């Protein structure tokens, strides 16, 4: 398990995370765009895959999200995350900018907040 994975997200909540990405109205995909979205403060929540190699592609994201007050969590597979983001390829990370379901997003963020201590 990579040092960048700071807490373990139950598979059920990982599924909800992938679903939140899949129904989002606007997202950023991959480490470069996600990093910019967090720096800009426009990301509502950041999803990071646990199997990114090299780990340095996303290792800085947890610190950065915490430093910008932006919630983040994990899913097991960059391939699953890219497919949820509507891609034909993997995505190391995704930032939800404009979500599909505001209530669902709010509940998901709360659940994540509980996991991260």
Swiss-Prot record:
Any single Pfam family the record assigns to this protein: Ribosomal_L7Ae
Transmembrane stretches, start-end: none
UniProt-annotated location(s): Cytoplasm
Protein keywords: Cytoplasm, Ribonucleoprotein, Ribosomal protein, RNA-binding, rRNA-binding, tRNA processing
MF annotations from Gene Ontology: box C/D sno(s)RNA binding; ribonuclease P activity; rRNA binding; structural constituent of ribosome
SUPFAM superfamilies attached to this UniProt entry: L30e-like
GO CC, alphabetical: box C/D methylation guide snoRNP complex; cytoplasm; ribosome
Record bears the keyword rRNA-binding: yes
GO biological process terms, semicolon-separated: box C/D snoRNP assembly; ribosome biogenesis; translation; tRNA 5'-leader removal
PANTHER family, sorted: RIBOSOMAL PROTEIN L7AE FAMILY MEMBER (PTHR23105)
Role noted for this protein: Multifunctional RNA-binding protein that recognizes the K-turn motif in ribosomal RNA, the RNA component of RNase P, box H/ACA, box C/D and box C'/D' sRNAs.
Subunit note: Part of the 50S ribosomal subunit. Probably part of the RNase P complex.
Family: Belongs to the eukaryotic ribosomal protein eL8 family.
Protein name: Large ribosomal subunit protein eL8
């Amino acid at each position: 398990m990579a040092v960048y994975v700071k807490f373990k997200v139950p598979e059920e909540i990982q599924k909800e995370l992938l679903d939140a990405v899949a129904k989002a109205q606007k997202i950023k995909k991959g480490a470069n765009e996600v990093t910019k979205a967090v720096e800009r403060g426009i990301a509502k929540l950041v999803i990071i895959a646990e199997d990114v190699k090299p780990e340095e592609v996303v290792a800085h994201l947890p610190y950065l999200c915490e430093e910008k007050g932006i919630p983040y969590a994990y899913v097991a597979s960059k391939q699953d995350l890219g497919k949820a983001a509507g891609l034909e390829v993997a995505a190391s990370s995704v930032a939800i900018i404009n979500e599909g379901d505001a209530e669902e997003l709010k509940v998901l963020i709360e659940k994540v907040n509980v996991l991260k201590q």
